[PDB]
Amino acid sequence: LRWPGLVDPNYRVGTNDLPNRITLYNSLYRYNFTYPTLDGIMYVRSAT
Amino acid sequence: NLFNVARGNLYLVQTATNGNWSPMAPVAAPPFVRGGPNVRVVGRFGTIVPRPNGLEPQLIDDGNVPRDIAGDWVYPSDVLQVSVAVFRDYVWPMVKA
């Protein structure tokens, strides 16, 4: 009952029981975020 | 002109010739006057936007629209005073070609 994500075949991916029970084996979702720096070229308005 | 001051605009086109060459007295008609057929006027910043993956860099015109470099362009004097590093690196080699 602590491990339905490993034992139970009827486990839907992403199901918790958090108001009742801590499930010790679940479907996380790893991330690979990229962090863009901004090194653009900056311009000035002409006198015209 | 008698006091070392020339009037009129300035043309920068590649003219590889062999015969007579008179810059001060252009014997031909002056090409691409401002507002002519598909002649484009650069906006106030003189701003090249870069484009990825082999696409040509676009130039922002007076109507704030990035239009492509190859063609006839009018630059105001004051735009070219501040875009001169962008001029020399992006659209001046396109003149030499």
PDB file of C-alpha atoms in Angstrom:
ATOM      1  CA  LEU A   1       0.000   0.000   0.000  1.00  0.00           C
ATOM      2  CA  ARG A   2       3.056   2.254   0.313  1.00  0.00           C
ATOM      3  CA  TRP A   3       4.338   1.050  -3.087  1.00  0.00           C
ATOM      4  CA  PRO A   4       1.496   0.877  -5.657  1.00  0.00           C
ATOM      5  CA  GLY A   5       3.623   2.396  -8.420  1.00  0.00           C
ATOM      6  CA  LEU A   6       5.961  -0.601  -8.315  1.00  0.00           C
ATOM      7  CA  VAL A   7       3.598  -3.467  -7.451  1.00  0.00           C
ATOM      8  CA  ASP A   8       0.046  -2.645  -8.520  1.00  0.00           C
ATOM      9  CA  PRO A   9      -0.640  -3.145 -12.249  1.00  0.00           C
ATOM     10  CA  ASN A  10      -3.624  -0.767 -12.219  1.00  0.00           C
ATOM     11  CA  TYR A  11      -1.454   2.210 -11.215  1.00  0.00           C
ATOM     12  CA  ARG A  12      -2.177   5.216 -13.393  1.00  0.00           C
ATOM     13  CA  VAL A  13       0.983   7.232 -14.031  1.00  0.00           C
ATOM     14  CA  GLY A  14       1.039  10.235 -11.721  1.00  0.00           C
ATOM     15  CA  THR A  15      -1.402   9.091  -9.023  1.00  0.00           C
ATOM     16  CA  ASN A  16      -0.833  10.008  -5.370  1.00  0.00           C
ATOM     17  CA  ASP A  17      -2.774   9.429  -2.163  1.00  0.00           C
ATOM     18  CA  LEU A  18      -1.436  12.474  -0.289  1.00  0.00           C
ATOM     19  CA  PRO A  19      -4.425  13.413   1.943  1.00  0.00           C
ATOM     20  CA  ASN A  20      -4.312   9.778   3.136  1.00  0.00           C
ATOM     21  CA  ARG A  21      -0.968   8.102   2.526  1.00  0.00           C
ATOM     22  CA  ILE A  22       2.599   8.795   1.436  1.00  0.00           C
ATOM     23  CA  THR A  23       3.424   6.717  -1.634  1.00  0.00           C
ATOM     24  CA  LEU A  24       7.139   5.887  -1.649  1.00  0.00           C
ATOM     25  CA  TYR A  25       7.442   5.108  -5.375  1.00  0.00           C
ATOM     26  CA  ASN A  26       6.048   7.451  -7.996  1.00  0.00           C
ATOM     27  CA  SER A  27       6.475   9.011 -11.419  1.00  0.00           C
ATOM     28  CA  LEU A  28       8.579  12.132 -11.170  1.00  0.00           C
ATOM     29  CA  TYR A  29       9.515  14.230 -14.175  1.00  0.00           C
ATOM     30  CA  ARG A  30      13.134  15.264 -14.614  1.00  0.00           C
ATOM     31  CA  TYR A  31      13.936  18.609 -16.194  1.00  0.00           C
ATOM     32  CA  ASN A  32      16.786  20.003 -18.270  1.00  0.00           C
ATOM     33  CA  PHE A  33      16.094  23.746 -18.163  1.00  0.00           C
ATOM     34  CA  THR A  34      18.412  25.984 -20.167  1.00  0.00           C
ATOM     35  CA  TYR A  35      19.301  29.394 -18.732  1.00  0.00           C
ATOM     36  CA  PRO A  36      19.797  31.926 -21.550  1.00  0.00           C
ATOM     37  CA  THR A  37      22.083  34.856 -20.973  1.00  0.00           C
ATOM     38  CA  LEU A  38      21.409  38.003 -22.976  1.00  0.00           C
ATOM     39  CA  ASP A  39      24.399  39.593 -24.714  1.00  0.00           C
ATOM     40  CA  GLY A  40      22.636  41.601 -27.382  1.00  0.00           C
ATOM     41  CA  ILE A  41      23.713  44.694 -29.285  1.00  0.00           C
ATOM     42  CA  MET A  42      22.255  48.009 -28.145  1.00  0.00           C
ATOM     43  CA  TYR A  43      21.428  50.928 -30.435  1.00  0.00           C
ATOM     44  CA  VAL A  44      20.754  54.651 -30.123  1.00  0.00           C
ATOM     45  CA  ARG A  45      18.200  56.769 -31.980  1.00  0.00           C
ATOM     46  CA  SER A  46      19.566  59.126 -34.609  1.00  0.00           C
ATOM     47  CA  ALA A  47      19.387  62.895 -34.261  1.00  0.00           C
ATOM     48  CA  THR A  48      17.388  63.246 -37.567  1.00  0.00           C
TER      49      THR A  48
ATOM     50  CA  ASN B   1      31.310  73.808 -54.813  1.00  0.00           C
ATOM     51  CA  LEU B   2      33.622  76.788 -55.144  1.00  0.00           C
ATOM     52  CA  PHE B   3      34.037  76.803 -51.334  1.00  0.00           C
ATOM     53  CA  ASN B   4      34.828  73.043 -51.047  1.00  0.00           C
ATOM     54  CA  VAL B   5      31.189  72.230 -50.164  1.00  0.00           C
ATOM     55  CA  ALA B   6      29.266  69.765 -52.302  1.00  0.00           C
ATOM     56  CA  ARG B   7      25.479  69.686 -52.405  1.00  0.00           C
ATOM     57  CA  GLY B   8      23.201  66.745 -53.043  1.00  0.00           C
ATOM     58  CA  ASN B   9      23.216  63.206 -51.759  1.00  0.00           C
ATOM     59  CA  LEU B  10      25.944  60.569 -51.825  1.00  0.00           C
ATOM     60  CA  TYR B  11      25.938  57.334 -53.810  1.00  0.00           C
ATOM     61  CA  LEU B  12      27.806  54.156 -52.849  1.00  0.00           C
ATOM     62  CA  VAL B  13      27.412  51.621 -55.647  1.00  0.00           C
ATOM     63  CA  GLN B  14      30.090  49.316 -57.007  1.00  0.00           C
ATOM     64  CA  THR B  15      31.153  50.739 -60.374  1.00  0.00           C
ATOM     65  CA  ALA B  16      34.009  48.630 -61.750  1.00  0.00           C
ATOM     66  CA  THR B  17      34.917  50.549 -64.903  1.00  0.00           C
ATOM     67  CA  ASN B  18      37.876  51.194 -67.150  1.00  0.00           C
ATOM     68  CA  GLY B  19      37.013  54.399 -69.032  1.00  0.00           C
ATOM     69  CA  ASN B  20      36.327  57.900 -67.797  1.00  0.00           C
ATOM     70  CA  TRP B  21      35.078  58.299 -64.240  1.00  0.00           C
ATOM     71  CA  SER B  22      33.556  61.626 -63.167  1.00  0.00           C
ATOM     72  CA  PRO B  23      32.127  61.477 -59.633  1.00  0.00           C
ATOM     73  CA  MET B  24      31.619  65.240 -59.450  1.00  0.00           C
ATOM     74  CA  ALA B  25      29.726  65.347 -62.767  1.00  0.00           C
ATOM     75  CA  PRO B  26      27.663  62.151 -63.098  1.00  0.00           C
ATOM     76  CA  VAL B  27      26.886  61.967 -66.796  1.00  0.00           C
ATOM     77  CA  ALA B  28      24.216  59.295 -66.252  1.00  0.00           C
ATOM     78  CA  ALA B  29      20.936  59.691 -64.420  1.00  0.00           C
ATOM     79  CA  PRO B  30      21.162  59.413 -60.614  1.00  0.00           C
ATOM     80  CA  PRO B  31      19.878  55.944 -59.706  1.00  0.00           C
ATOM     81  CA  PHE B  32      17.269  55.066 -57.044  1.00  0.00           C
ATOM     82  CA  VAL B  33      15.946  58.406 -55.779  1.00  0.00           C
ATOM     83  CA  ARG B  34      14.224  58.326 -52.395  1.00  0.00           C
ATOM     84  CA  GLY B  35      10.721  56.919 -52.596  1.00  0.00           C
ATOM     85  CA  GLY B  36      11.408  55.190 -55.901  1.00  0.00           C
ATOM     86  CA  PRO B  37      10.599  51.653 -57.029  1.00  0.00           C
ATOM     87  CA  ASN B  38      11.404  49.355 -54.043  1.00  0.00           C
ATOM     88  CA  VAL B  39      13.921  51.743 -52.469  1.00  0.00           C
ATOM     89  CA  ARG B  40      14.011  51.419 -48.692  1.00  0.00           C
ATOM     90  CA  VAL B  41      14.783  54.036 -46.041  1.00  0.00           C
ATOM     91  CA  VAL B  42      16.401  52.935 -42.778  1.00  0.00           C
ATOM     92  CA  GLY B  43      14.667  53.833 -39.527  1.00  0.00           C
ATOM     93  CA  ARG B  44      16.146  55.917 -36.767  1.00  0.00           C
ATOM     94  CA  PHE B  45      18.271  53.282 -35.051  1.00  0.00           C
ATOM     95  CA  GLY B  46      19.998  51.652 -38.015  1.00  0.00           C
ATOM     96  CA  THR B  47      19.363  48.203 -36.610  1.00  0.00           C
ATOM     97  CA  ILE B  48      20.269  44.868 -38.215  1.00  0.00           C
ATOM     98  CA  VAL B  49      18.384  41.910 -36.794  1.00  0.00           C
ATOM     99  CA  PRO B  50      20.263  38.601 -37.139  1.00  0.00           C
ATOM    100  CA  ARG B  51      18.512  35.555 -38.498  1.00  0.00           C
ATOM    101  CA  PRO B  52      19.352  31.936 -37.651  1.00  0.00           C
ATOM    102  CA  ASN B  53      20.373  28.958 -39.774  1.00  0.00           C
ATOM    103  CA  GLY B  54      21.866  30.572 -42.852  1.00  0.00           C
ATOM    104  CA  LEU B  55      19.136  33.159 -43.336  1.00  0.00           C
ATOM    105  CA  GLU B  56      20.326  36.608 -44.327  1.00  0.00           C
ATOM    106  CA  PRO B  57      20.330  39.411 -41.737  1.00  0.00           C
ATOM    107  CA  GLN B  58      17.399  41.776 -42.107  1.00  0.00           C
ATOM    108  CA  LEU B  59      17.486  45.556 -41.778  1.00  0.00           C
ATOM    109  CA  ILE B  60      14.787  47.587 -40.041  1.00  0.00           C
ATOM    110  CA  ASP B  61      13.458  50.216 -42.423  1.00  0.00           C
ATOM    111  CA  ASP B  62      11.580  53.453 -41.697  1.00  0.00           C
ATOM    112  CA  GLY B  63       8.303  51.574 -41.231  1.00  0.00           C
ATOM    113  CA  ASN B  64       9.872  49.472 -38.435  1.00  0.00           C
ATOM    114  CA  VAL B  65       9.865  46.371 -40.654  1.00  0.00           C
ATOM    115  CA  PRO B  66      12.950  44.148 -41.036  1.00  0.00           C
ATOM    116  CA  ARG B  67      13.616  44.063 -44.772  1.00  0.00           C
ATOM    117  CA  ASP B  68      16.470  42.272 -46.499  1.00  0.00           C
ATOM    118  CA  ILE B  69      19.775  43.939 -47.276  1.00  0.00           C
ATOM    119  CA  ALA B  70      20.251  43.291 -51.005  1.00  0.00           C
ATOM    120  CA  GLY B  71      18.595  46.115 -52.902  1.00  0.00           C
ATOM    121  CA  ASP B  72      18.510  49.899 -53.001  1.00  0.00           C
ATOM    122  CA  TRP B  73      18.799  51.703 -49.666  1.00  0.00           C
ATOM    123  CA  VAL B  74      18.662  55.316 -48.511  1.00  0.00           C
ATOM    124  CA  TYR B  75      20.471  56.122 -45.297  1.00  0.00           C
ATOM    125  CA  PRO B  76      19.983  59.432 -43.520  1.00  0.00           C
ATOM    126  CA  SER B  77      23.195  61.071 -42.371  1.00  0.00           C
ATOM    127  CA  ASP B  78      22.388  60.881 -38.671  1.00  0.00           C
ATOM    128  CA  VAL B  79      21.429  57.211 -38.832  1.00  0.00           C
ATOM    129  CA  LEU B  80      24.773  56.413 -40.440  1.00  0.00           C
ATOM    130  CA  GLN B  81      26.579  58.368 -37.709  1.00  0.00           C
ATOM    131  CA  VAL B  82      25.383  55.895 -35.070  1.00  0.00           C
ATOM    132  CA  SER B  83      25.002  52.702 -37.125  1.00  0.00           C
ATOM    133  CA  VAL B  84      28.509  52.996 -38.574  1.00  0.00           C
ATOM    134  CA  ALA B  85      29.878  49.844 -36.941  1.00  0.00           C
ATOM    135  CA  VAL B  86      26.718  48.018 -37.978  1.00  0.00           C
ATOM    136  CA  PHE B  87      27.041  49.604 -41.430  1.00  0.00           C
ATOM    137  CA  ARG B  88      30.670  48.581 -41.908  1.00  0.00           C
ATOM    138  CA  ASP B  89      30.154  45.005 -40.715  1.00  0.00           C
ATOM    139  CA  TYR B  90      26.773  44.014 -42.175  1.00  0.00           C
ATOM    140  CA  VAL B  91      25.740  46.108 -45.184  1.00  0.00           C
ATOM    141  CA  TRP B  92      29.013  47.626 -46.388  1.00  0.00           C
ATOM    142  CA  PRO B  93      30.425  44.202 -47.457  1.00  0.00           C
ATOM    143  CA  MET B  94      27.164  43.755 -49.340  1.00  0.00           C
ATOM    144  CA  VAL B  95      28.056  46.928 -51.275  1.00  0.00           C
ATOM    145  CA  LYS B  96      31.491  45.570 -52.213  1.00  0.00           C
ATOM    146  CA  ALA B  97      29.796  42.468 -53.610  1.00  0.00           C
TER     147      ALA B  97
END
